[PDB]
Structures are given as C-alpha cells and as structure tokens.
C-alpha cells in the first residue's frame, strides 16, 4: 500500500547534505592532495514537502528500521554496504524468471 505519516510531528522541510562538491570537477579540485578537507566535500539543498513526499519519507525511515535491524543482526560483516546492490540484484532476478 501507500504509507501514512503517523509520527507525533514531521518537520516538513528537508534541508539535506550529500556527497560531492560536484563542481570539484575543475582545476585541481579532484586531486586528493588539493581540494576540500574532510568537511568540505558535501553539498546542501532544500526539499519542500511537495505532496506527502517528505512526511511519507520520515514515516518510511521509521517503518523500515525493524527489518533493517534484524538484517543487521543476521549479517556477520561489521560494516554493511551491499544492501542496495542486494536489492538491485533481487530486482533483476525477479524479471528474469518467476
């Protein structure tokens, strides 16, 4: 089905940060020597709550936690990155057979 935000509150803007000073693709900005420090690589952005999108999201973020926790318990590796390449494989397998 579709989700229904059920948290006590939802601060509907999403001021986000994410990886790439993606005009760091100029000069020598890319040479590890030169460039940003550990805390200059990120970029900002604002996402407004267009439709239920963001509240929806925060609600998903909540709902997933349980399974994602159980998955972690099952996993033996200390730092898990594979989860999305995991789903992407699952996805392909799905439309290439049953």
């Amino acid at each position, epitope marked *: 089905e579709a989700i229904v935000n059920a948290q006590p509150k939802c601060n509907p803007n999403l001021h986000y940060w994410t990886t790439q000073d*993606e*005009g760091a*693709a100029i*000069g020598l900005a890319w040479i590890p020597y030169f460039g940003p420090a550990a805390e200059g690589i990120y970029i900002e952005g604002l996402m407004h709550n267009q439709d239920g999108l963001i509240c929806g999201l925060r609600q998903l973020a909540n709902e997933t936690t349980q399974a994602l926790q159980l998955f972690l318990r099952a996993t033996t590796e200390l730092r898990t990155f594979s989860i999305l390449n995991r789903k992407a494989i699952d996805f392909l397998l799905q439309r290439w057979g049953g």
Partner: antibody
Framework: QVQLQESGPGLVKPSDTLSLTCTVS????????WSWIRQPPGKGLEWIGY???????NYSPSLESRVTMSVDTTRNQISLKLDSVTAADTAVYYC???????????????????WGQGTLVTVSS | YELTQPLSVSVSPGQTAIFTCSGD??????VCWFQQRPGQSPMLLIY???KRPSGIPERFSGSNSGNTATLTISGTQSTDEADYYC????????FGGGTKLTVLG
C-alpha cells in the same frame, strides 16, 4: 598558475585563412578541453569549437565547413584556422579553457572557466 | 535551439537584480552564467545551474528549472555593471543574447 595567451591582434585579408594560436604556460595542456569563442564589435558571444588533446575536435554547425582547430602538446599550443574570411568575421577571438568531468554517463566539458584576454582580428584589404 | 535573455535589467543600489534566461525545456540542461565588464574578457559566474567558482561572491546565485534559469545578484553595486550571458549545451553550444545591467539612482 594556468595562463592563456592568444597570438596577437591584427590583420587578415578578405577571403584569406585566419590563423591564430593560444599558448598555455604554467601547466600541462592535457587535462582540459580547449575552445575558441569570438565576439564581433557591439555584439554577443559565438562559440566556434572545442578540442580535447586525445579527441576529435567538434565545431559549430554554422562554421563547420570553414574552421579547424589543432593541438601541439610539445609547444603547449592550440591553433585555429578559419577559411574564406569576410568583414562579418572581424571580432575579438578568445582562447577558452573548459574543465573536464564525468556526469550524465560521459566525460563532458563542465564550464568555460578561464578566458584569455582575446585577440582582435580585423578583416581588411 | 535558442536561449532568450532580456536586453536590459536595472536595479537600485544595494538591492537585488534578477536575470532571466529561457529556452524550451531548459531545466533538462546545465546552465552557466558569465559576466563581462566593459573592455574586458568574459568571466564565469555560475556553472551547472547554481555552482560558484572561487572568486565569485555568495551574493551571486543561479537557478534553473522548467523553462527558466535565473541569475540573482544581492547587494548589487555599480561595479557590477556589465553584460551578463546565459549559456547551455544542446546539440551544440548556445549563448543567450546577453543582458546589460544598469545600476540606476
């Protein structure tokens, strides 16, 4: 510091081939795209073409049949040649650096990020 | 493909100047903005819609969506008087016609 210097302002006769060079100093040619961009008196900007040191040059559709560009890695120079020159070709010619990066599934020019002083070419008999 | 800029934009001193640059589905493309002071070479102000090279103050900002890109200058000075060019990439490079900025009063 990467500097760009166009050949030298001056004359070309009508119907002749314009020849310009841009000399890049404090830095290697190979990491950037290089373009020529011109500006007729009292008018706007017109891109002529660009080239990568290891690639094929691409030119503007409206100048394609009259123009070529070349690179000399040992002299650290870019050349421009423009055929069948007329009064409509009188302009400031800028040598222009364009950065190279990966986005939208390819390496691409990202910005005309450094412009030379330009060289004024006047076409006349 | 063509980019459309107004011939002229004017502003009161210390206030906000807004430049528009429009083209069919311009938001699907990356836009650069350039400044050209009189007797001078063009200079990159904005690339990839809203990114600033070093040397370009924060009062310069870019945006691009739908059919319209904008350049915004906060706290505009008479020293900002210049021609401002929009630029993108279609099948080939395309420049807007340029907008002359005049600081009035």
């Amino acid at each position: 510091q990467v500097q760009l210097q166009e050949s030298g302002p001056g004359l070309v006769k009508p119907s002749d081939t314009l020849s310009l060079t841009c000399t890049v100093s404090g830095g290697s040619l190979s990491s950037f795209y290089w373009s020529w961009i011109r500006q007729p008196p009292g008018k706007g900007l017109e891109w002529i073409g660009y080239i990568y040191y290891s690639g094929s040059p691409n030119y503007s559709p409206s100048l394609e049949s009259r123009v070529t560009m070349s690179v000399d890695t040992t002299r650290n120079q870019i050349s421009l040649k423009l055929d069948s020159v007329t009064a409509a070709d009188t302009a400031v010619y800028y040598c222009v650096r364009a950065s190279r990066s990966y986005y939208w599934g390819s390496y691409r020019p990202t910005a005309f990020d450094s412009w030379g002083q330009g060289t004024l070419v006047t076409v006349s008999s | 493909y063509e980019l459309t800029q107004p011939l002229s934009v004017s502003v009161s001193p210390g206030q906000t100047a807004i430049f528009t640059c429009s083209g069919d589905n311009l938001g699907d493309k990356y836009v650069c903005w350039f400044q050209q002071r009189p007797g001078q070479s063009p200079m990159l102000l904005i690339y990839q819609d809203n990114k600033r090279p070093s040397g370009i103050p924060e009062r310069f900002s870019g945006s691009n969506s739908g059919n319209t890109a904008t350049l915004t200058i906060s706290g505009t000075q008479s020293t900002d008087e210049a021609d401002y060019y929009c630029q993108t990439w279609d099948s080939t490079v395309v420049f807007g016609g340029g907008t002359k900025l005049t600081v009035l009063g």
